[PDB]
Write a protein that binds this ligand. Structure first.
Ligand code: HEM
Ligand code: HEM
Lengths: 150, 149
């Protein structure tokens, strides 16, 4: 069960981090690709002009993970579940399914997300901060995974 | 290709890390599973008692460190990775068979390097990272070359 304290940690830290979301997004994908460079191959549009990490579609993907994870924290506290629109969740499940996104990709992304947050707000970092973000993310991913089918 | 410094970096760091190899091997494997817990499912003997308390984690964690250091020595001496064709064929067969993919090798590389960074911070440097990464990369390339039915 996701708590008031956890929601607060995610909501506030995101309000802080959102202020520098241009470098946050690059640091996020840099960390994903540092851990698992072959994850690049999942993105069709990455082949793109060098350095390929500049690809303009990477920023909004990174930001979407951040925004929807914070949103999940709020929903988890309020409704006790992730409440993404059924039609959006279907589109998310299908596109991640057909592009061969697997558990290890979601997991590398979680680890990269938490390292990115630690790097971005060292002064707010704590084990409860890590778990708050991590648990919100896990629930978002579980909802996407429920629609990952043909 | 592989320099005397690169070799000495891998060799000397391993000598220090080896003295605590069991603690280091466990830190290493748990780091892999912190990054990607589903990697656990590749291993028939893991996927269950808590990972942190499972002695079967020891052999594979250790073999990565030991074989990677061996690779650095072989690369300096012979210009290439010198694993016996029968051992390399078995290594290729087994990783192919269990469905190990690039991302698994890459997560392991990152975990290895983070483990070493944390274990001997006094020896850590960009060159230390490069030396271990290259010895690992060359060994991995050799295993991959035999990852076939
Ligand atoms: C919280 C988890 C995630 C969320 C909320 C999310 C969000 C999104 C969104 C909104 C799109 C569609 C954007 C567009 O159509 O332009 C998308 C597509 C995509 N995402 Fe994710 N994503 C997540 C996890 C991941 C992970 C872990 C990976 C792999 C490392 C990944 C790789 C991809 C790929 C390959 C596409 C298709 C891009 C294309 O071909 O246009 N996603 N994601
Ligand atoms: C340079 C890196 C690696 C080395 C030196 C290495 C070495 C080995 C060795 C010596 C074995 C035992 C083979 C035998 O029974 O004769 C083995 C097995 C295995 N490896 Fe690796 N490995 C490496 C990378 C990886 C990675 C990245 C994964 C995936 C996370 C992986 C997964 C497995 C699995 C599932 C087995 C079979 C279970 C076992 O016998 O322990 N290996 N590996």
């Amino acid at each position: 069960v996701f708590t008031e304290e956890q929601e607060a940690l995610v909501v506030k830290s995101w309000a802080v981090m959102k202020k520098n979301s241009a470098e946050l997004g690059l640091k996020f994908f840099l960390k994903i690709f540092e851990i698992a460079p072959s994850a690049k191959n999942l993105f069709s549009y990455l082949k793109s002009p060098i350095p390929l990490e500049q690809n303009p579609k990477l920023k909004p993907h990174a930001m979407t993970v951040f925004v929807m994870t914070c949103e999940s924290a709020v929903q988890l506290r309020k409704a006790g579940k992730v409440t993404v629109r059924e039609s959006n969740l279907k589109r998310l499940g299908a596109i991640h399914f057909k592009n061969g996104v697997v558990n290890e990709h979601f997991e590398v992304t979680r680890f990269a997300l938490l390292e990115t947050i630690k790097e971005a707000v060292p002064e707010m970092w704590s084990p409860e901060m890590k778990n708050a973000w991590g648990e919100a993310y896990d629930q978002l991913v579980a909802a996407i995974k429920s629609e990952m089918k043909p």
